[PDB]
Amino acid sequence: RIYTLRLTRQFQFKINKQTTSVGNLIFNADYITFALDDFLQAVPNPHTLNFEDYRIKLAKMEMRPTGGHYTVQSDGFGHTAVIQDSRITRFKTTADQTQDPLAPFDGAKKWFVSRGFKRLLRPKPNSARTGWIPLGTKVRHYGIAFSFPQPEQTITYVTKLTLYVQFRQ
Amino acid sequence: RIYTLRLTRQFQFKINKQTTSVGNLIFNADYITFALDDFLQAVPNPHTLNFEDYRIKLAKMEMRPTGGHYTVQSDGFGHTAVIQDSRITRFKTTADQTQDPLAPFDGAKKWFVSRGFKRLLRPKPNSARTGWIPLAGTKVRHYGIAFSFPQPEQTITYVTKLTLYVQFRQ
Amino acid sequence: RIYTLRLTRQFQFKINKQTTSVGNLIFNADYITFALDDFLQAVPNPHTLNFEDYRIKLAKMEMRPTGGHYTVQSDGFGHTAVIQDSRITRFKTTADQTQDPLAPFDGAKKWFVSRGFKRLLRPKPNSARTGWIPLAGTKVRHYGIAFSFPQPEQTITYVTKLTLYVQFRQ
Amino acid sequence: RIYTLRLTRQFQFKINKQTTSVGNLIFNADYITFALDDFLQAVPNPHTLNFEDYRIKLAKMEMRPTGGHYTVQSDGFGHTAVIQDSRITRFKTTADQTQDPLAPFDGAKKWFVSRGFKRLLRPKPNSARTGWIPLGTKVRHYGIAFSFPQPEQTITYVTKLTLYVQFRQ
Amino acid sequence: RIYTLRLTRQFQFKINKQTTSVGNLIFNADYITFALDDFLQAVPNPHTLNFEDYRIKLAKMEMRPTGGHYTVQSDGFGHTAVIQDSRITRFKTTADQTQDPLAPFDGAKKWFVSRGFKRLLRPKPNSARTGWIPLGTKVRHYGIAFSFPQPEQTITYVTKLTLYVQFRQ
Amino acid sequence: RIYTLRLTRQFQFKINKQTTSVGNLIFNADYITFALDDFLQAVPNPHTLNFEDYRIKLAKMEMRPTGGHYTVQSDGFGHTAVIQDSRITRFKTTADQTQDPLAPFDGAKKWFVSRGFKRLLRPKPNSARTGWIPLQAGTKVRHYGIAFSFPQPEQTITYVTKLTLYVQFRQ
Amino acid sequence: RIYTLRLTRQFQFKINKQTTSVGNLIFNADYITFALDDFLQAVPNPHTLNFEDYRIKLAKMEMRPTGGHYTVQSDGFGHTAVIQDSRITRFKTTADQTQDPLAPFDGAKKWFVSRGFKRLLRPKPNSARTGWIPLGTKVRHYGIAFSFPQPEQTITYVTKLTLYVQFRQ
Amino acid sequence: RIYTLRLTRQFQFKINKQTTSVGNLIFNADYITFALDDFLQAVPNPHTLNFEDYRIKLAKMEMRPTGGHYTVQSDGFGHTAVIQDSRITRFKTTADQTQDPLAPFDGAKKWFVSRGFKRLLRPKPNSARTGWIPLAGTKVRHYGIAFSFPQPEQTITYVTKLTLYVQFRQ
Amino acid sequence: RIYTLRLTRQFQFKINKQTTSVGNLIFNADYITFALDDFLQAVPNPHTLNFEDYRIKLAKMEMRPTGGHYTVQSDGFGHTAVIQDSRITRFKTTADQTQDPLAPFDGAKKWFVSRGFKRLLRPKPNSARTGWIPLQSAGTKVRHYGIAFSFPQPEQTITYVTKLTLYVQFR
Amino acid sequence: RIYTLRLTRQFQFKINKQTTSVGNLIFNADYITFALDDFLQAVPNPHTLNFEDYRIKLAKMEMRPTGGHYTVQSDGFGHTAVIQDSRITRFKTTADQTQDPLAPFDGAKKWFVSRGFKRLLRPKPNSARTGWIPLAGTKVRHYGIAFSFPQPEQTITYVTKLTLYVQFRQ
Known about the structure:
10 copies of one chain form a homodecamer.
Chain A: E1 2-15, E2 27-34, E3 53-66, E4 77-82, E5 109-112, E6 117-121, H1 127-130, E7 133-134, E8 141-149, E9 155-168
Antiparallel strand pairs in A: 1-9, 2-8, 3-6, 3-7, 3-9, 4-5, 4-8
């Protein structure tokens, strides 16, 4: 018997207007990781239940523009990629690049800057094989990265993350 | 915090060939009710976990023909209806009916005998208002789905799967 | 304020196998009319409620094969037509015809004998203009839907469901 | 001002089982032409109205199997073709042919023998140019031909023809 | 025998421009409840009929922008949730929230601020079980709540509520 | 034998910017009726053809914005309703309403102000039962009818309206 | 044996802003005819081949806005109509019209001024019956007309015409 | 200037009932090639027109069952594959195979034996690059489409139509 | 740089007619596992190409009826389930079951006996985390799990053609 | 056995506002070619593997507006065309044209300036027939896709992504 718990949190994300080499195409990127404790603030504590292990079965990231940005105002496209190891940490690019850093990655999916994206993924921490983790709740799971060409104007987004967490006795 | 558990069970159902007033249209009906205990045989009891109460959020009934019955073989249509009280029990009538007993009911939906059906429902048992039942508690019966059918010229066997989507609260 | 009441009844219909001029195409037809009293067997008279008038806003006829007839077994096509006057009464044809009697009618819709049909219509009885009839009153005949068919090689039995959408006003 | 009249008639059509060269693929064909008088027998005549001319705007042929033939019982495919002159008459095939006689024709459309077909066409008779004809009603309009590979068993069809006729004063 | 009556009413709704913590993501929410007297006039009226009980079978809320707001103008997304008791009242928030108050709820559905939303629900008042209430018509039914991230500019909406009410003798 | 004639005419319609109770939600409405004479501007009387009766089988109203109005610019929604009697005439509202006057009506359909609408209807005038009206006065018989409501917008919106009549004549 | 040749040409078309009866609805219209020589400027001549006759089987007209016009900017709707004789010429009206001149015509199809339109047609010149013309190439074929309510601002379009021409030996 | 010509021809194809290792899964295959001369039997030669060269831009193969075979009668699935050189000839196949010979090939697409298939392809013969062939020239063989199938329990007859879309330029 | 190789093999599978508890509903099940060596007999070992590791990114199982079985002949439904450990091995049932053994499993998907099924999965063998396995071959024989499928026992025997597809990555 | 590799690169493309013959319709065009070395870097690299040959099975070009251009702001339509030899070079037009230079071409596909386009193609370099090239080598240029456009009233900037689907064999 597997019990499932859905958790969610939100935050703002900004893509800043291009200020260097204006008129040329440059890319940047960022990334998101997942830990059960990131989502256990407004929620009672699972350890008080007689569950032995938990597993992050599925995660969802949805980032959509706000601040009055026009969806019909084109700002190019970047990519999203599911990267399931610590290597993802290098994708909060400190320097601008001339090429999209995530387009070459396995399973890279295009997304349009002015419309945002929604993507499902299976983030990864016997645990190494199945993902079942003893209750622990701070174990980092990787992960989703997203790239973008730098736009002419700053764009603000609302990001919602959703965890689909499994528990077994 | 709401935890969700999916449970399922299956069984055979048979619509027997018409042997009475053959050549004329007659209807019968049957029904299904839901209790958490119906689904807790291969599964430990959730109260061994420190859950306070449970609620049957959703139920699904899918009944599909087997035994070699042809789906393209027309055997008319009956109806399904969600009936959320003990009154549903009156619907497996020992005697045949001349009219479809469920067609008049609120939310009745047609189904073709040779195809079967799939239907979702919210079966119902302060608990009387919310549906939360303390974790004998697992045996509270929830109602309910009835299904009617015109009697066919030949017997039809079905595979039925029931699914419970059960909520547990901390 | 308009209150709506949905009523339904079912019956068997049969298209008999062709026995005359076998091997040639012949057509027959039948028709259905609607009266509130046809549907009030299981319901008290709405006049016991303080309703003054009623109106048959909409009617639905669904006729689907049964008796094991194969839907993939081709038996040609006839037509359905909404006929809102006494002329419809001539369409329970006592004699066979060489042409489809309903195909020429305004709004005629093709239907395949082996599949049946479903059709909505607005049957017709200040009453003459609006359809509002004082609540005798429940027996006013409303017309109407006719359906034609080429005579098949073998007898086909159908289950017919009729639905009335009846309006009542305050 | 154009007034439109819809006329229809039906008849049985039969494709006989192959009795020659059994086991080999052969094709035959037939055709249909349209004249207003073909459809006016059960219809009060337009002659009684003060219309000057008529024109066959559109014609429809629908031929569907009957006699208990199974639609899932495959019997190959032939073609339909719109042929707008007297040449069509040669397509009531006297002799079996080794190739589909209509497949090469302009606008030929496949149809499956066990399903039948539905096809719209603009049959053709200043009248030669526009189609307007003085009220006359026996002018022949061409036309639709249909071919078929000869099946192993006889198949009977119900055929409905529909005329969409325009009238002007 | 069940007789059905459809009732409807409309009103304006405003999401005010963000004036606190400007530049940061904050959420607010509101809610709607349903009483038959919200929709009824003195004429015509079901009380004058001989019905014994009524039941709100279904309710519909549709809220759509007006005032010239651009639908292609992105303003993020909030959530709707069906809440079937008086607790819903705590979602008319006086204090702004850093997290979406309805996203965690069972059955929460995303909606985009600049688009509005349409949602069906079964609001709740043996009456507690079936919903049948003696005619009375002031009984309050719950309920639908909706959240939103505070936008940069005020947005005005047209809201239509619809009740599908059943009556029995 | 039924002969069908399709007729059409167009005109401009305007919803004026709200000038009363500005900032609050108010509704207005208007309506359209149909007479064969409305559409026979350029066609001889069908009676000169040997037709005896006519019947308005179907009518269509399509109203779409013009004047550069943005379809993506939201201006709320009103309703359309088919009203087949003289009661429709009261929907040329001289006074503003706080509620949508057509939303409660049987068959009311929502439409978005910034998009316009298209709707089919069967307008109504033995004639009372069937709709067949003698030709000769007959062509001026008014048929009812479609009404449409709207919340008053912040700015004036101009529309193009096309009406289409599907008229039957029998022998 | 029928050989087919596809030819295409483009040009600019303009609907000028309304200057007469400003504030009121007025209509205008224009039209397009087809001759093989209109399309043989950058293509070798077919008579160098041993083709006896040619026939314009199909024509396509596509007119789409340019010059930065917003497709979401409503400017009403007009109609297109296929008119297969020389009378089509009367539709380039020197005077504005109070009604849409093409809406009454058989087969008229609505088109929205701010989106443009695309339409297929069979333009018309034994030749009158079939359309086969001896190679001749200047024969005029009619034709497609399009009407429009006059807009508040000028709208520029790109028009592409395509001919599908048949040749037989 | 490019002129286009559509040509077509038909023939019967049969998949014989399994007679070897009956009860076990075995595969066979066949193939089709294209030459303009295959399609010019009822057509004059384009060189009588002053065309210099031709090119097969596109080819279509459609093979559909006949002889009364039931499309709902499951007989497994094989594959089709476009193979653009003479190696296509290697699927004779003189010996039955235990594996589907075309499933591994690039671009292989599944087809169900009881339904047949339709597929478009670009068959291939400066000419080696462009495909333009001077107008013996009409006999250049273009490759090609192969199709495999698991051997059925009963013989299945098909009608096959090939279509050529040939370009000619001045 | 990731290089992808698609490999496929086929075989026959049979569901035998019910001979125990005839007239009652019983279920059985079977399962499939994946090893690169199961698909690499015609192809030389990818280690002869200068590849160091391989990883089974994706696997597909498609099982469709043959032997003349009618797709319109109903024979109920079972389930498929992705099981990524040794537990799958117990699902070639030695005994008939009164309940569907795979219906309770995470991600179980219904399939109809008379139609067959098609399902994609990610079968599982730093290798334990990522799936990258060294080439040498012991590596190419590492068993990956896995897909199990259950079925109600039918009244007559049904034969299927099964095609397995491996999507293998090399770096 | 065929191993497949996906490669991608991006760059900015710009259609400049019209400055000549302002007010009249004129066309210009450009083109893209493909070489494996356009997409490769010094490490990792295919040469270090024991592959005999490679070939570009498929290429994809996607060009989409950026810089804040409104997709709903109409700027007409041009065409894309696959041109598989060096003649394509003549389509980076130095002089403005009154007619669309690619619209007459075989397989020309319309595209709207304000929306951009996505197109698949088979670019071309026994090698001339099949595309297989020995690992010249990775520098062989493959042709090719050209795209035309009516000159707009304002400058439009695009992001372009090219994708190569490369096959390798031992």
